[PDB]
Paper text:
SWI/SNF is the prototype chromatin remodeling complex and regulates the expression of 5% genes in yeast. Within SWI/SNF, Snf2 functions as the ATP-dependent motor that drives the fundamental DNA translocation reaction underlying chromatin remodeling, whereas many of the auxiliary subunits target the enzyme to specific loci of the genome. To understand the mechanism of nucleosome recognition, we report the cryo-EM structure of the yeast SWI/SNF complex in complex with the mononucleosome. Based on the specific biological activities involved, the SWI/SNF complex is delineated into three functional modules: the motor module, the actin-related protein (ARP) module, and SRM.
The most featured element in HBL is Snf5. Different from the homologs Sfh1 and INI1, Snf5 has a long C-terminal tail trailing the FH. In the absence of the nucleosome, the FH of Snf5 forms a short helical structure and packs against the INI domain intramolecularly. The current high-resolution map of the nucleosome bound by SWI/SNF enabled us to detect the FH of Snf5. Nucleosome binding triggers conformational changes of the FH, with the N-terminus adopting an extended structure and stretching out from the HBL, and the C-terminus forming additional helical turns and interacting with the acidic pocket of H2A–H2B. This interaction mode between Snf5 and the nucleosome is conserved with those found for Sfh1 and INI1. To obtain experimental evidence for the importance of nucleosome binding by the FH, we truncated the C-terminus of Snf5 (Snf5mut), and assayed its biochemical activities in vitro. Consistent with the structure, the mutation did not perturb the assembly of the complex, and the mutant complex showed an ATPase activity comparable to that of the complex with wild-type Snf5 (WT). Yet, relative to the WT complex, the mutant displayed a 5-fold lower remodeling activity under the physiological salt concentration (150 mM KCl). Interestingly, at a lower salt concentration (50 mM KCl), the mutant showed activities similar to the WT complex, which is possibly due to the increased affinity of the motor to the nucleosome at the low salt condition, bypassing the requirement of FH for stable substrate binding.
Residue numbers in the entry:
A (entry chain A): 37 to 134
B (entry chain B): 20 to 101
C (entry chain G), H (entry chain C): 12 to 118
D (entry chain H), I (entry chain D): 29 to 121
E (entry chain M): 663 to 680
F (entry chain E): 40 to 134
G (entry chain F): 17 to 102
DNA sequence: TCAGGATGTATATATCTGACACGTGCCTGGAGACTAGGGAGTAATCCCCTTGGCGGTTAAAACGCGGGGGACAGCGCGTACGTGCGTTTAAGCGGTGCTAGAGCTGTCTACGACCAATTGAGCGGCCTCGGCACCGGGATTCTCCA
DNA sequence: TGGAGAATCCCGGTGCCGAGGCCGCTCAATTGGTCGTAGACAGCTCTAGCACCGCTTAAACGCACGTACGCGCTGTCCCCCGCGTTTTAACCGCCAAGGGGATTACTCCCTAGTCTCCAGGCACGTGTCAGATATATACATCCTGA
């Protein structure tokens, strides 16, 4: 029999690993293409410094991490371990974004 | 020079890596589309304020200080870029 | 006459003259009193000393002798009053405090 | 061009606190942004305090009240003590 | 009071190194 | 007699219809003076200051109870509990 | 000359008042443990506002807390209040 | 010789000279342009007209001829953009919007 | 000592919009506080914009950028239209 | 589903008030005119940093496949919260008195703006070595099947 | 409860580029004056905050009861996780073009400052009518019976 872990062990090891590290988790080039595509809808033919895209990526990843923490608190509050979109909607509703 | 459908560049493993950093143990399947939606909303707000700050200075280059000022104006002060 | 810096009179490391210039050029008031940059430089030096002390302790706890932004994040978020002061602040390359919820740990 | 910063003063304070510890450039820029941010906060609060009482001078009283408004608890008490000690040492000489 | 007495000793070593 | 919940819904409609203050003035004034005694003794208060504190406190508590009701509905209850208040204040960033 | 010291006025925020505040917020059913938690939350909020109001008063070297001090404290906490001046 | 107010030159009801004096005496910048008070007075008059129109409609819908703070609260919280602008503003004697959740009502 | 307010101007705007509608005293004070609050927001944003570009005068471009930064969507578009119309009518005569 | 009893709600009208609308003197602040100085607009140049393209590597993304574990619905039971009633308690209203303190006014001086001369502290540029990244390897440690 | 096996901590050698130190060169901080005005201080006024009393009645409190909702338990099934294999595009290095950010010089017009003039708006009285409260009342809503 091959070695297979139970569901939840690899999740906990990924949690410890990505909470131990400090690098960015989204790939640079798709985020850069997304930033340019979004900024195309405001003024055409814009240029970006590289540090501007790095600042946008740092702020976006920090915002998403805090949002997932509030989501996990909502999901634990509803006696679950699986986050669902209504948890995100409740978190953004309490925060004052929607 | 038109870009299209780059929101799928934020893939499912990248979203679940952000969720692992946030402490999440189990993730449903619709979380990815919901996360792409909220990310596009947040980036639209910040990029709109940054492009406004750039257009006031009569520049065609969005510098890092415009992003820092936009995040400062939205109450999300970011350290380490000037 | 030979010149002594205003920072040397107050026994400070932070520049009182630069703080006075920034207070004058910041359009904060019409006039700036003489004691105000001394007080402000003292406050800034104290807060810098607090954060640098906690960051140096966090850097020693990882067997490193050079402070990286991760150590600054560990210094701020582990202290109650400093986290209350910087609750809206995002630190670049800072990471997250390691904390896993209790209901996710196996039984 | 000349761009002023707070690097040498943060380095002097670091050598005063941890005499054998260095600091990366990214951490130096973060500490520089921190010093600038706290300076703008305290100066803006002192400007509001001067405008509210219909005064036209920012003195050490306005800075002390802005510190007591902006800093929580023991940080506020220690910062007020440090500022008062520095001001008396400055005016004594 | 446990954390409050710690921060006074933080200040005095600064005054002790100076 | 009415079934439980009818007078509750009637009170919900009635107190959302009107605008007056819901806390009594004199106990709130005594509470404000008792709290302000711990910062500086022998303080005086203008009546408009106490009224402003009452308006701000009632608005804060009503918004907190709305967020509490949302977190209570999220757990499929109709009864708010202290864990709901703790969750709302934690997500808001106060705790 | 009578230095009256007040104590235990947080019980003056009665259970019917908390019920009315919850009814305005749309709450249908209220637990029995809600009232002490609500008194604690109200005490924390009032302490945070009154401390800044007293700081603004002490800076002005006055003995009375004016309404503008409360308005400035609520502004400083990001809870701007209309209809009392300024 | 014959004077004419700056509000009448721009066709405004709000005072241009008062906004000019407040901008000068508010310590916002060293100098103040000539068009800035006209522009700001126009923006303030537009926002005042926009909220007063909705408040008058809300007062008319309740068969009242005087605007009370309840009507201002209804006018702000019922329009999404004014609610977005005043999301952190408490209106005194304003009440709340009548809104009951659907899961609380019987069926 | 006389205290100034925007009472008569708010009353004139109300008579322009709803000719047969009055306003109570508390609602008038709320409108006065609203006008003061929006004025401080736009003036502070224009001050920060002029300081960011190392300029020493607040012109109408700073006010227009502050309006586009503070007001959401249709309010921003119509307020920019109103301000440009008023400035054009002012400098055209 | 239909309907009667019953209770609470919005609706029809009086009347009485005190709060809003409006008119008056005046005085302070807004407007008109003129002068000067510098801040900003404009032009020209330069070179840095952005954009675009291409090739190779390989790590990460994508897709499919079991399979267990968690979400969810249903049910039963009991506690605890809503509802009503009668007793109790203090909030509210009005009226009076008093003085602490807020606010205005007039003098008067110490303190900060302004400016010119002077110079060393701070900043840009350029070595330089050591702290940290990286990797190969072995011991410890945790997880899964008995 | 004990072994097999994957992951991770710890040791140790090696390279490399970024932190630290030094050195030359500004230009911003310092020092020394004059000046005028903001602010401290005294003294008077007079408003509003505090304290007290009596009456009334509305709201708070306590208690009893029943039911509806919270919560624990069980069963089901489906869906998310773990793992292997294959595709694919991110990443890194390198090269080439050029757009625009940044700087310097020049100049002029825009705005601060001062003085004079006048009228717009603010405190103060005074009327009068919108709505608050009260009374009478048909109608919507809810509960029990069928």
């Amino acid at each position: 029999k091959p070695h297979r872990y139970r569901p939840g062990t690899v999740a906990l090891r990924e949690i410890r690993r990505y909470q131990k590290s400090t690098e960015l988790l989204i790939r640079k080039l798709p985020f850069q293409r997304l930033v340019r595509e979004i900024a195309q809808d405001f003024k055409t033919d814009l240029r970006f410094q590289s540090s501007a895209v790095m600042a946008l990526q740092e702020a976006s990843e920090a915002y998403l991490v805090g949002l997932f923490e509030d989501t996990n608190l909502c999901a634990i509050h509803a006696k679950r371990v699986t986050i669902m979109p209504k948890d995100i909607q409740l978190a953004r509703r309490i925060r004052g974004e929607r | 020079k038109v870009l299209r459908d780059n929101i799928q560049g934020i893939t499912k493993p990248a979203i679940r890596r952000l969720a692992r950093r946030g402490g999440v143990k189990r993730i449903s399947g619709l979380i990815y589309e919901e996360t792409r939606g909220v990310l596009k909303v947040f980036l639209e707000n910040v990029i709109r304020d940054a492009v406004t700050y750039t257009e006031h200075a009569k520049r065609k280059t969005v510098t890092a200080m415009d992003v820092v000022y936009a995040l400062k104006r939205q109450g999300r002060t970011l350290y380490g870029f000037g | 006459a030979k010149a002594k810096t205003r920072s040397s009179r107050a026994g400070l490391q932070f520049p009182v003259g630069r703080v006075h210039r920034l207070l004058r050029k910041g359009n904060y008031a019409e006039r700036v009193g003489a004691g105000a940059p001394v007080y402000l430089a003292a406050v800034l030096e104290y807060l810098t000393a607090e954060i640098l002390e906690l960051a140096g302790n966090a850097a020693r706890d990882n067997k490193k002798t050079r402070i990286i932004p991760r150590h600054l994040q560990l210094a701020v978020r582990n202290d109650e009053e400093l986290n209350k002061l910087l609750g809206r602040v995002t630190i670049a390359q800072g990471g997250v405090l390691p904390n896993i919820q209790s209901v996710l740990l196996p039984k | 061009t000349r761009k002023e910063s707070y690097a040498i003063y943060v380095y002097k304070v670091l050598k005063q606190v941890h005499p054998d510890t260095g600091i990366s450039s990214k951490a130096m820029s973060i500490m520089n942004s921190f010093v600038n941010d706290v300076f703008e906060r305290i100066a803006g609060e002192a400007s509001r305090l001067a405008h509210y009482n219909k005064r036209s001078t920012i003195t050490s009283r306005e800075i002390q009240t802005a510190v007591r408004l902006l800093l929580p608890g023991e940080l506020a008490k220690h910062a007020v003590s440090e500022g008062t000690k520095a001001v008396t040492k400055y005016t004594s000489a | 009071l446990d954390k409050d007495k710690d921060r006074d000793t933080r200040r005095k070593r600064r005054q002790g190194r100076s």
